[PDB]
């Protein structure tokens, strides 16, 4: 039992609701919060920029020392960082942005980098400004995540579609 609420059920693990992640990241304090990274951790706009903006920048500060001793991520992976007062650690997962000419088979080595925590909140990876099809990228998600993960989707307009086109 966990204390996501209001989230209809789509598979054995995988559940959505219509919901900004940040207000969502805020009423549960997840262990773990998924962020649309980039390989840079540049969280400028999008799912990145608003979690950012909740942390305060501290998200940035952190990242940018991340990437300073690390170097950037690859398109396709992952770094777990803190979640500063959004969850305890926040995921910062890099899904192809089709907007930079990105291989979409990308998309399902991105999610699996889920498949390393038991529960998470995350949202549709490489949907929104990475301009990729969000029916796609829930599709990939069912069919690769294993772990219990709640998809927040901001837009209701697009919320009902993904719910009414589920196979
Ligand atoms: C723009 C974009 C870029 C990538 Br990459 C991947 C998803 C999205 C969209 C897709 C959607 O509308 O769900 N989502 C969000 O921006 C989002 N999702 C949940 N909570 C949020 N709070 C503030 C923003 C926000």
Partial sequence: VNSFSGYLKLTDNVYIKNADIVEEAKK???????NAANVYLKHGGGVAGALNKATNNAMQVESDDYIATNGPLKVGGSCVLSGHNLAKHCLHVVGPNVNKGEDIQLLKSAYE???????????????????????????????????????????????????????
């Fill in 28 to 34: 549960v304090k997840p262990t773990v919060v998924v």
């Fill in 113 to 167: 980098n889920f498949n390393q925590h038991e529960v998470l909140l995350a949202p549709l990876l490489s949907a929104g400004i990475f301009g990729a099809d969000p029916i796609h990228s829930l599709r990939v998600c069912v069919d690769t995540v294993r772990t219990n993960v709640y998809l927040a989707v901001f837009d209701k307009n697009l919320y009902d579609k993904l719910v009414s086109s589920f196979l």
